[PDB]
Amino acid sequence: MDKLDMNAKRQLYSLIGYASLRLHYVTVKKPTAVDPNSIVECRVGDGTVLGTGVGRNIKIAGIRAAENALRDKKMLDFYAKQRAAALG
Numbered sequence: 352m353d354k355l356d357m358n359a360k361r362q363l364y365s366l367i368g369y370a371s372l373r374l375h376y377v378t379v380k381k382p383t384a385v386d387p388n389s390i391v392e393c394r395v396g397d398g399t400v401l402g403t404g405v406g407r408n409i410k411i412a413g414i415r416a417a418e419n420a421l422r423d424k425k426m427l428d429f430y431a432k433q434r435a436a437a438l439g
Contacts, residue, residue: 354410359417363393363402366421367430369437372396376413380405391416401426 360374368374373396380389389412393402402420406412421427 354413356410356413356417359414359421363417363420365434366427367401367434369430369434372401372430372434374401376416378409378412380412388412393417393420 355376360376364374374393375395376391376393378389378391380386380391382389389406389408391404391406391409391412392400393416394400401423402416402418404412404415404417404419406415
């Protein structure tokens with residue numbers, strides 16, 4: 352079900368996540384007092400956030416972060432030409 356941005360995460364992994372790019376999401380929100388919402392940062396296997404986006408919860412923020420990564424048509428094309436070209 353919806354919780355870890357299935358479609359969004361599947362999109363990134365299906366468009367750029369080939370292997371070396373361990374598509375992972377690290378939430379730093381921790382709702383309390385200083386944290387106003389659910390902020391997540393999609394980090395690759397190496398060590399670079401490709402998708403950063405906030406949300407109401409881990410589900411929303413997760414979809415927002417992945418969506419932020421999908422927005423980069425240029426960055427998506429570079430990987431899309433590798434992930435899609437690496438497999439078929």
